[PDB]
Design a protein around this nucleic acid. Structure first.
Ligand SMILES: [K+]
Ligand SMILES: [Mg+2]
Ligand SMILES: [Mg+2]
Ligand SMILES: [Mg+2]
Ligand SMILES: [Mg+2]
Length: 117
RNA sequence: GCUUGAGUCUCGUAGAGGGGGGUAGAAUUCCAGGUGUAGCGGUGAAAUGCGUAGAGAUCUGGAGGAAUACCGGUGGCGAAG
């Protein structure tokens, strides 16, 4: 058991799912939650409401650790990016700073072929 | 015979013009290790598929291949490609 100030939160917002992971600043996981685990299944997994409920669930699963004044980062283009941080703020965590990171390949490798629909 | 076409010499200017050799950063994949955990992925909707042997997530190190975000253009060079 530990009390931590300025813990780290990672949001992974895909188009088909959303993952929230709370780790120490050094990247050792303390807790995690998904919209898939929140009881949703299939298309509804992508709704921002599912992201918010997954965020609440992760906050509950991490409340034991005295996390406060948390620092969060968001990655991915999926919807509900702001819903997750809204849920985190409402959960009672003091939010100090937030950062955005998304990989940019600088013309690395060939992507898959366009989808004929 | 002549200098107006054509060509030679002196001084400068711009350019993804070509051939050879080095080197750098970002990203995907694989491998090893740390945290910890029951889902991940995909779709109109699903299923096939991957996960307790420890996945997906997150942090550290390594391997290898390919291509050069922004500048970037309404831009430039080449006989054309
Ligand atoms: K040349
Ligand atoms: Mg040149
Ligand atoms: Mg050259
Ligand atoms: Mg590992
Ligand atoms: Mg020309």
């Amino acid at each position: 058991r530990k009390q931590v100030s300025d813990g780290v939160a990672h949001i992974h917002a895909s188009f088909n799912n959303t993952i929230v992971t709370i780790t120490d600043r050094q990247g050792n996981a303390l807790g995690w939650a998904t919209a898939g685990g929140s009881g949703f299944r299939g298309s509804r997994k992508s709704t921002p409401f599912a992201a918010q409920v997954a965020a609440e669930r992760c906050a509950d699963a991490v409340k034991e650790y005295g996390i406060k004044n948390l620092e969060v980062m968001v990655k991915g283009p999926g919807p509900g990016r702001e819903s997750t941080i809204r849920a985190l703020n409402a959960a009672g965590f003091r939010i100090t700073n937030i950062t955005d990171v998304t990989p940019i390949p600088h013309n690395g490798c060939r992507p898959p072929k366009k989808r004929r629909v």
